[PDB]
Design a protein around this ligand. Structure first.
Ligand SMILES: [Mg+2]
Ligand SMILES: [Zn+2]
Ligand SMILES: [Zn+2]
Ligand SMILES: [Zn+2]
Lengths: 773, 114, 43, 264, 65, 196, 160, 133, 180, 86
RNA sequence: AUCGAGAGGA
């Protein structure tokens, strides 16, 4: 475990890390002392002989240099001490141990390594200071702060080895992770606070600031966009200048809780051809969200374009925020006099409620709830009463916060802070708890020697009425310290137990690998799964799509999907097709549309059998929503001209498309049924959206566009298939163990103790429960 | 330890010139001038003066890293207008403005007491 | 230096928790984190 | 007078000049105060050789304090940079050599002020090298304190430099700087609880401008052209010459670009 | 351990104002806020240089060698 | 670090010209992010800055003692008497441009501490240094010019990445690779190999 | 419990139902009771479902309990990762713990088993039982310092 | 390259939706029924109070980069005192021969009601919005 | 402290005793020491087991009689609803250790933050002793210009923190600026 | 055991080249390119041995084969000409 | 090279 499964290595480095907004995503700032120390063996060719001879001439004391020269004899020429470090003549086939240089592939690591995304390859950028520089949008997969954290660096020593870093372990390749099937990187904490303030309707930018912001985008085309305001003064909106970093052909639609197309609260997000329309950009758009900007750009444009997208969003927003400014003071914690008076009114009326229940319980007039004691009914009611007061008075403060309140702006952008931080700072930190209950009678029948015995009041049992702004009393201070100590014990306990959980998960699943027959097996050849994930798809190219056959009335399903050519009221209108009048009454084609409608009926019954609750949004391989918008833009589609798609074109085209979604290729009835079972959910999504009425009426595709959608779907499906050799068991164990390490906290055992019960199968469970219907 | 010498903020190294002029790609009559060993003192003053000449279409400066004292200036001018002449007239207009500033201060200084 | 001369140790039933009886005799806040949290105390 | 930036000296002293800068763009007024902090030259100590040190302080401790001592730099332009002069290490054309010896003869505490520095090299008749003394008692900056029996003997070579290389070469302490005291341009968004007018105090420069009409609309096409500065000098260079050499070093930086263009 | 020569934030010289400050407190029976303003220290960045300074050197001289 | 659990390292160093500035010419010795404030609820950090600002401006001492009647409103009444904004905000100007900042900055003195963790005590890089005796592996410790540990927790990540050759290279070429001779009958390392 | 149910019109609607939750469990005598739905009874004790309702019913009950552990803390892991864990704990016919007496008692390689826990005791028994290590394990090649059958190393490369 | 729409509106409602420079406007059309207007207007530049009458115009023109206005040589296409530029993104059929057009002037939005303009107002990148006194 | 009847409960320590204590402090006349408070029975030593039988007051204002318009910025104290006092606390802030007595306003901080700073105070740099030039220590680390803090605890006087400090009153801006 | 090969017909594995066999092929070429093996593409100012192999792969000039092993010891040989790179 | 404690990072 200490010299074979892991060992100390040469060509390693370690130092403190810091952030660099002017670095790239897959770049790493390397100190020149380290770059002078670490070497790479480069064999001389005609393509490097002139450069390598200069590096030897530069020597090992200043960068870019070299430290050793290896001949065919195999003896190293120490360039520090050799008398012939001036008259070297590099014969071909020799090795030159040059310095680490710019754009070299190196492995960057942050410990504990609970992730494949904790050890991923970076590009060298030699920097003139003593720290490892890295982009801010790579901190989240490392869980790396800049308060003194350290990171490691490993240097490959052969061309085969550098290939694995650049082509497998590179940073842009790990942006959209198989763990949680979503991107793990995103805009964070200054870009995030800035990209909200930039993208308000009230934020307009003048000409002088726009041109600096425009030239700050590296791959800019030189075209100055036309200002959104022209006549009184040429102003650009913040939405305008931000859209220059977004590539063309990006479509993003999201509706947030009030989002008409007029969008009065400026919420939601519509992005049309790389230019945003009416959305304020915040964490839901630009964070590490499912179906965000990063998720779209990585899938549509690619990893390299998305890695460029991080820096371009950062270089524009960090520029604007540097000349805008943003602070936070104690004034951002103060609510109004009227608001503070109503807050202490809210606490007083809840303390009177505890007094009345206490007087009720004292006269034995309490009715005990079923299955619990008289005291347990009392404790449950008082904790509920005091938590109601802390939450209501906190919401009384959060409503009072203005839009200029800087704590609110970080909350509104989602960069840092929550509601409870506002509540505990400005209104009431609230009830403290040890071991789930209130503060125990550590003394005989009291909590502190400043109380009389048998005192169950909020003050006695550890309710902190004051906020951090108002200042805690000495009793409030001690009870807060008593609960706060418990969190420090829980943090130290859960970190040690989860590290054992993650190691146990890994060591059991370390040999589970997808083989070339798509079977998920182990070293013995035993089948764990016959198809990986039961469907054979790499979780990186998987996202949530709605199966919209599940929901709606039986009439609305009929109104949207049924085509009756033998009817005149329920037929395809001649507006939708060049054959609108020719096709009416066709018997040989209505048998096709009755065949298609029978599968949509059969699939809808099948999907309700699987998803009993009626949930439509489920992770599926190929995002068909985006391919339709891609078709409406590539082939410029008007919704007035009729299509040229035959009934036979759509129906027999989709059935031919399903024949080409291959996951397994065996020519026998078992594998063909394994294949037909593995693609059933996707073909349920395929027929629901490539149905005849939906294409001709809602999409209005041409035959050119329809054949293009069929080509993309077949292409994106085959890319989403798992690659044989994928060590999916280690990936499975780390995808569970890492979010377990972030677990930290109504009578059921949950979280880390329950996960320890499940993995270490508990013959004596802490909370067995039976759910009876 | 790793920190560079402080004179590199203003002292040109070996093989380094003060200005480097490079033609812009996909931008007609536009140029990118790499100013070496300078900072926002010069770049913000040159750029703001290029905005006052009404034959200049684009003027912007940026420091690609605070580690290194250098910046890039991009100028785009009208057809038949070398941006170097736009840079020359902007630089010369800075000097004549500072020349009058120096004279008007020395006039008001000698008028004062204490 | 003053903190080290007033440091206590408990060599090893909830010992690491801040007890009510610790009032005024031991510091509520001053203790190490992680390993030996709550066992090492300061007067 | 002359066509361009207008200056109105409101208050002037040996140590402070409060003036108004009219008809200037924001970039020129900003690049004026930037170059006043950073890039105008000054003489200060850049090498200390310590013969004997029996003090309670380290040599590098005292050597760092010696660099912060304000020396005279009125005629600094007649002195050359040591990197530019053709000497071996330093000379009288490029450096000023100072001597400091002190012994704790008294039973009481013996103080080492900067008045005790002795100029050794030939000044060649220019106002340079002299440590600035603004104390009313004539003593300098309190460099060290000696007990009886402690001595300190060192030599300081003062060279020429700017505050970009080290902050000891800064002739200015603080450049006050304010434009638009009424926020009529709306260049900032005032944070407030109840009323922005009551929670923020009036600037002194508000008395030197017209208040806006609350019924009048936003003067959107206006720009910043009137600035309010107050320059303070440490003493190494007089206050008028901090801003004049500030202007002159600024236009020398622009003129080097013209010479660079003519060479390419 | 001994008075800083200049203020850290702006660079105003404060090394000459130490003995005048101690005499302003004791000989003239002044409070620290008026003695700081008397020495021309108006900005609080310069004010904390003198007001928060601990003259540890006076106890370093008490050791005999 | 400050006195409220707010720890951080120096990410950059700016001069006074590049640094933002108030109209008085006062310049920060330190800039911290507002995002270290709200998640940690270190309100006393911001009350310290408000109290230290009034004490410096008035020449008195700041009574930051626990369990007192020192209120933020009482301090802000004193700061407003000194002609500053009561909650400590100050209009600051961008040092790169001279244009004002749109937001006003929380600005004042705050007692900061220099911790024992400096970078040049942590820098390490090996590139084939000295080895141990028993295991023929790199030695432990940066004082001994050792190697960083490619532990089994890291072996996990290279397996999940699928990088077999890098995993083999760290285990062999950057570490204790060795050649032995074995017999074809019994699979033991008991063969005498006279090489020359 | 609120519950979504298909309406006769076709929509899903909120049809609330009274549900009993207990403080203890032994399922063998609970579902055989009138008035209940014995097709919908549920236990957090998946070990009972394995021995009462079968292994595959225990398999789905095993996943559902892990899923609640993740989702209650706001997180989200994909199905394939948790299901791969559950299938490894199930494919031996019964519940196999991730424990030194558990997965580490299987017929895998001795060098692979010795890398987790009970290191020398595994190698001691393997020396006596005359165990043959296939060296298909990833840990066997990490010990041997060879290119393991992992990704890049899952095949061979030959000439054309 | 000419005018696409012209009408005269009367503002019914002005809405500062937690903003300081932008109010969302609600304007009813005279000279025609079934035609209402909703628009985000910079009130810091062009103030709009209630019960005002605003001549609203939409043009196709009068890509290539924006040149700054050389003062007198460049002939304006606007005798108006407020001009914006935007992009159409949605067309809404309210009723049979009733239509709605959505524009986005960099995040300032536009809603236009009517029935007759089916020839004009194509789903185009080109949209200039002109407002008279 | 010791409360007794005087009946009406009152602190045994009176202001005449404080004047004699401070007369001894200024004289630096039958010096009035700590033991003079102990031997005159005004101050008792209570351990953890004996304080199970006592009722402590939090401040001598808890022995004041009762009788509205209170300052809304002050914190919320509770009327104790208890009157059988036998002791009073000397000062509530005396529950803290040496390192936690450096923390300014720790009643306005959440509890693990005071725990962290109490551990980081031992990592702060300053003058550990005035004879560091005479000692030959394996490692020594002295600040050039130590400063006494502008915000001080009243328990700093006995800990000699204003005499041997460990930091500097830096001018701090809380601001986003260039993203570094 | 003895010659458990699969014919060129009845090959059931994926025709698309996996990311794990792309990285090995590019690394194996860039290894021997670095040791002065002949290059089968007109390098258009390309010096990096990896970018040579990436240009050699995009023109299918790599004379290697992929022996994809199956869990029963059987194997399918696939030339780099046959495999699809997407 | 073996033990022992202190600390950093979560
Ligand atoms: Mg950290
Ligand atoms: Zn010279
Ligand atoms: Zn100062
Ligand atoms: Zn043998």
């Amino acid at each position: 475990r200490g010299n074979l499964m892991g060992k100390r290595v040469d060509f390693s480095a370690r130092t403190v890390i810091s952030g660099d907004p002017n670095l790239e995503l897959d770049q790493v700032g390397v100190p020149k002392s380290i770059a002078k120390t670490l070497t790479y063996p480069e064999v001389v060719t005609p393509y490097n002989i002139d450069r390598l001879t200069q590096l030897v001439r530069n020597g090992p004391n200043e960068h870019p240099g070299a430290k050793y020269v290896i001949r065919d004899s195999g003896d190293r020429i120490d360039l520090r001490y050799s008398k012939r470090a001036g008259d070297i003549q590099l014969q071909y086939g020799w090795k030159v141990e040059r310095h680490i240089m710019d754009n070299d592939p190196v492995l960057f690591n942050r410990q504990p390594s609970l992730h494949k995304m904790s050890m991923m390859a970076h590009r060298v950028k030699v920097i003139p200071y003593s720290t490892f520089r890295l982009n801010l949008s790579v901190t989240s997969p490392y869980n790396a702060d800049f308060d003194g954290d350290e990171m490691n660096l490993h240097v490959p020593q052969s061309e085969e080895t550098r290939a694995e870093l650049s082509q497998l372990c590179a940073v842009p390749l790990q942006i959209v992770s198989p763990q949680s099937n979503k991107p793990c990187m995103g805009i964070v904490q200054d870009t995030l606070c800035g990209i909200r303030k930039l993208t308000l309707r009230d934020t307009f930018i003048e000409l002088d600031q726009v041109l600096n912001m425009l030239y700050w985008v590296p791959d800019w085309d030189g075209v100055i966009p036309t200002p959104a305001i022209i006549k009184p003064k040429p102003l650009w909106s913040g939405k305008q200048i931000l859209s220059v970093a977004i590539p063309n052909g990006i479509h993003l639609q999201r509706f947030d809780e009030g989002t008409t197309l007029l969008s009065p609260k400026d919420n939601g997000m519509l992005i049309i051809d790389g230019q945003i329309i009416f959305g304020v950009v915040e964490k839901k758009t630009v964070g590490s969200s499912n179906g965000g900007l990063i998720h779209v750009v990585t899938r549509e444009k690619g990893p390299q374009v998305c890695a460029k997208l991080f820096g371009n969003i950062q270089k524009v927003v960090n520029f604007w925020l540097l000349h805008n400014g943003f602070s936070t003071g104690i004034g951002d914690t103060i609510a109004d006099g009227p608001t503070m008076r109503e807050i202490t009114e809210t606490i007083a009326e809840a303390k009177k409620k505890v007094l009345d229940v206490t007087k009720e319980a004292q006269a034995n007039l309490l009715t005990a709830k079923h299955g619990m004691t008289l005291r347990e009914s009392f404790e449950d009611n008082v904790v509920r009463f005091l938590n109601e007061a802390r939450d209501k008075a906190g919401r009384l403060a959060e409503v009072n916060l203005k839009d200029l309140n800087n704590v609110k702006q970080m909350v509104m952008a989602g960069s840092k802070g929550s509601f409870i931080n506002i509540a505990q700072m400005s209104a009431c930190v609230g009830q403290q708890s040890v071991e789930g209950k209130r503060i125990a009678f550590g003394f005989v029948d009291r909590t502190l020697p400043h109380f009389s015995k048998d005192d169950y009041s909020p003050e006695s049992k550890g309710f902190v009425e004051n906020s951090y702004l108002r200042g805690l009393t000495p009793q409030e201070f001690f009870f807060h310290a008593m609960g706060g100590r418990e969190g420090l014990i829980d943090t130290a306990v859960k970190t040690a137990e989860t590290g054992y959980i993650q190691r146990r998960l890994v060591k059991a699943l370390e040999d589970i690998m997808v083989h070339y027959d798509n079977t998920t097996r182990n070293s013995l050849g035993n089948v764990i799964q016959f198809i990986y994930g039961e469907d054979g798809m790499d979780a990186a190219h998987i996202e949530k799509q709605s199966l919209d056959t599940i929901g709606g009335s039986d009439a609305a399903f009929e109104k949207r999907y049924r085509v009756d050519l033998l009817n005149t009221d329920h037929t395809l209108d001649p507006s939708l097709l060049e054959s609108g009048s020719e096709i009416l009454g066709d018997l040989k084609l209505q048998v096709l549309l009755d065949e298609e409608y029978k599968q949509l009926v059969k699939d809808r019954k099948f999907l309700r059998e699987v998803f009993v609750d009626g949930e439509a949004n489920w992770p599926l391989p190929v995002n068909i929503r985006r391919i339709i918008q891609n078709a409406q833009q590539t082939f410029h589609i008007d919704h007035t001209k009729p299509s040229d798609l035959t009934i036979k074109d759509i129906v027999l085209g989709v059935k031919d498309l399903q024949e080409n979604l291959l996951v397994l290729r065996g020519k026998n009835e078992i594998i063909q049924n394994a294949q037909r079972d593995a693609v059933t959910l996707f073909c349920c999504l395929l027929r629901s959206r490539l149905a005849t009425r939906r294409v001709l009426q809602e999409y209005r595709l041409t035959k050119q566009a329809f054949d293009w959608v069929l080509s993309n779907i077949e292409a994106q499906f085959l890319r989403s298939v798992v690659h044989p050799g994928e060590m999916v068991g280690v990936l499975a164990a780390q995808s569970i163990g890492e979010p377990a390490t972030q677990m930290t906290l109504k009578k059921v055992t949950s979280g880390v103790p329950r996960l320890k019960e499940i993995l270490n199968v508990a013959k004596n469970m802490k909370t067995p429960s039976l759910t009876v219907y | 330890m790793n920190a560079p010498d402080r004179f590199e903020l203003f002292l040109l190294g070996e093989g380094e010139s003060k200005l480097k002029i490079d033609p812009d790609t996909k931008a007609p009559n536009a140029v990118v001038i790499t100013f070496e060993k300078e900072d926002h003192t010069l770049g913000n003053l040159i750029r703001a003066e290029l905005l006052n000449d009404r034959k200049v279409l684009f003027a912007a400066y940026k420091v690609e890293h605070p580690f290194f004292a250098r910046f890039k200036l991009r100028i785009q001018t009208t057809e038949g207008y070398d941006p170097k002449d736009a840079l020359k007239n902007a630089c010369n207009s800075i000097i004549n403005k500072l020349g009058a500033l120096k004279t008007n201060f020395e006039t008001e200084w000698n008028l004062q007491t204490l | 230096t003053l903190s080290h001369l007033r440091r206590t140790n408990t060599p090893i039933a909830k010992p690491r928790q801040l007890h009510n009886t610790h009032w005024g005799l031991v510091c509520p806040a001053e203790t190490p984190e992680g390993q030996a949290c709550g066992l090492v105390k300061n007067l | 007078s002359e066509e361009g930036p207008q200056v109105k000296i409101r208050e002037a002293s040996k140590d402070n000049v409060d003036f108004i800068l009219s008809n200037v763009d924001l970039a020129m007024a900003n690049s004026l105060r930037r170059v006043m902090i950073a890039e105008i030259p000054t003489l200060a100590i850049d090498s200390v050789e310590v013969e004997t040190n029996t003090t309670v302080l380290a040599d590098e401790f005292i050597a760092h304090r010696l660099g912060l001592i304000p020396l005279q730099s009125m005629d600094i332009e007649q002195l050359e940079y040591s990197r530019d002069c053709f000497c071996e290490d330093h000379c009288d054309k490029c450096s000023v050599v100072l001597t400091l010896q002190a012994f704790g003869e008294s039973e009481s505490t013996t103080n080492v002020y900067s008045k005790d520095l002795v100029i050794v090299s030939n000044l060649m008749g220019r106002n340079i090298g002299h440590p600035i003394i603004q104390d009313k008692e004539g003593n300098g900056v309190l460099i060290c304190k000696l007990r009886k029996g402690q001595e300190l003997k060192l030599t300081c070579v003062a060279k020429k430099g700017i505050a970009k290389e080290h902050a000891k070469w800064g002739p200015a302490a603080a450049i006050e700087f304010e434009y638009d005291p009424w926020n009529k341009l709306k260049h900032t968004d005032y944070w407030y609880e109840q009323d922005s007018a009551k929670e923020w105090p009036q600037s002194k420069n508000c008395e030197y401008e017209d208040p806006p009409n609350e019924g009048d609309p936003f003067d959107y096409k206006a720009q910043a052209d009137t600035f309010y500065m107050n320059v303070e000098s440490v003493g190494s260079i007089p206050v008028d010459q901090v801003v004049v050499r500030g202007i002159d070093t600024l236009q020398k930086k622009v003129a080097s670009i013209l010479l660079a263009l003519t060479q390419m | 351990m001994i008075v800083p020569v200049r203020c850290f934030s702006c660079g105003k010289v404060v090394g000459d104002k130490w003995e005048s400050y101690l005499n302003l407190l004791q000989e003239d029976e002044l409070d620290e806020g008026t003695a700081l303003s008397r020495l021309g220290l108006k900005r609080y960045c310069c004010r904390r240089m003198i007001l928060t300074h601990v003259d540890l050197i006076e106890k370093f001289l008490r050791y005999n060698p | 670090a400050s006195r409220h659990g707010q720890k951080g390292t120096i990410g950059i160093t700016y001069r006074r010209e590049d640094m933002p500035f108030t109209a008085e010419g006062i310049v920060p010795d330190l800039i911290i992010n507002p995002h270290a404030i709200p998640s940690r609820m270190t309100v006393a950090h911001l009350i310290e800055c408000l109290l230290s600002k009034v004490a410096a401006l008035s020449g008195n001492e700041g009574d930051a003692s626990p369990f007192t009647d020192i209120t933020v409103e009482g301090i802000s009444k004193l700061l407003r008497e000194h002609g500053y904004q009561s909650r400590g905000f100050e209009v600051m100007y961008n040092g790169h441009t001279g244009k004002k900042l749109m937001a006003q900055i929380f600005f004042g003195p705050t007692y900061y501490q220099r911790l024992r963790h400096m970078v040049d005590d942590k820098i390490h890089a090996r590139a084939r240094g000295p080895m141990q005796v028993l295991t023929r592996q790199p030695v432990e410790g940066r004082s001994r010019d050792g190697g960083l540990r490619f532990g089994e927790m890291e072996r996990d990540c290279m397996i999940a990445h699928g990088a077999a050759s890098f995993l083999k290279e760290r285990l062999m070429e950057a570490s204790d690779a060795f050649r032995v001779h074995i017999c074809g009958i019994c699979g033991l390392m008991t063969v005498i190999a006279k090489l020359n | 419990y609120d519950r979504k149910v298909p309406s006769p019109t076709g929509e899903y609607v909120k049809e609330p139902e009274w549900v009993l939750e207990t403080d203890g469990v032994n399922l063998s005598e609970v579902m055989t009771v009138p008035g209940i739905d014995p097709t919908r009874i549920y236990t957090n004790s998946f070990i009972d479902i394995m021995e009462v309702l079968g292994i595959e019913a225990g398999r789905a009950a095993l996943y559902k309990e892990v899923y609640n552990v993740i989702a209650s803390d706001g997180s989200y892991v994909n199905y394939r990762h948790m299901a791969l864990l559950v299938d490894v704990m199930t494919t031996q016919g019964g519940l196999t713990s991730v424990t030194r007496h558990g997965f580490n008692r299987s017929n895998t390689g001795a060098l692979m088993r010795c890398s987790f826990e009970e290191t020398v005791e595994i190698l001691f028994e393997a020396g006596a039982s005359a165990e043959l290590d296939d060296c298909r394990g990833v840990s066997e090649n990490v010990i041997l310092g060879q290119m393991a059958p992992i990704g890049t190393g899952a095949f061979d490369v030959m000439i054309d | 390259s000419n005018t696409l729409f012209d009408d005269i509106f009367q503002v019914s409602e002005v809405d500062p939706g937690r903003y300081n420079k932008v109010c969302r406007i609600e304007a009813a059309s005279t000279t025609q029924d079934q035609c209402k207007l909703t628009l985000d207007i910079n009130v810091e530049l062009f103030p709009v109070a209630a019960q005002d009458s605003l001549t609203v115009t939409i043009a196709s023109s009068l890509t290539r980069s924006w040149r700054p206005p050389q003062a007198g040589d460049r002939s304006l296409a606007d005798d108006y005192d407020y001009v914006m530029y935007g992009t159409a993104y949605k067309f809404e059929e309210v009723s049979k021969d009733l239509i709605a057009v959505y524009y986005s002037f960099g995040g300032l939005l536009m809603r236009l009601e009517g029935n007759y303009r089916n020839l004009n107002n194509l789903k185009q990148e080109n949209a200039y919005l002109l407002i008279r006194r | 402290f010791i409360v007794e009847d005087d009946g009406h409960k009152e602190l045994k320590v009176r202001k005449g005793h404080i004047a004699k204590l401070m007369a001894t402090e200024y004289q630096d006349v039958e010096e009035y020491t700590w033991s003079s408070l102990l031997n005159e029975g005004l101050v008792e030593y209570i351990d953890a087991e004996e304080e199970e039988s006592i009722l402590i007051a939090m401040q001598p204002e808890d022995l004041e009689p009762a009788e509205l318009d209170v300052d809304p910025a002050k914190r919320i104290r509770v009327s104790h609803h208890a009157t059988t006092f036998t002791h009073c606390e000397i000062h509530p802030s005396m529950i803290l250790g040496v390192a936690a007595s450096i923390i300014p306003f720790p009643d306005h901080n959440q509890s693990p933050r005071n725990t962290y700073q109490s551990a980081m105070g031992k990592q702060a740099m300053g003058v550990f002793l005035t004879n560091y030039n005479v000692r030959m220590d394996t490692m020594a680390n002295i600040l050039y210009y130590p400063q006494k803090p502008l915000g001080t605890t009243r328990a700093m006087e006995y800990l000699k923190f204003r005499e041997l400090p460990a930091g500097q009153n830096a001018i701090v801006a809380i601001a986003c600026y260039s993203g570094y | 055991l003895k010659e458990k090969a699969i014919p060129k017909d009845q090959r059931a594995t994926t025709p698309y080249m996996t990311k794990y066999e792309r990285a090995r092929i590019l690394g194996t070429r860039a290894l021997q390119i670095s040791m002065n093996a002949p290059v089968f593409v007109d390098l258009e100012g390309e010096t990096d041995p990896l970018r040579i192999a990436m240009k050699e792969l995009a023109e299918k000039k790599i004379p290697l084969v992929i022996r994809r092993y199956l869990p029963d010891g059987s194997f399918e040989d696939w030339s780099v000409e046959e495999l699809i790179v997407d």
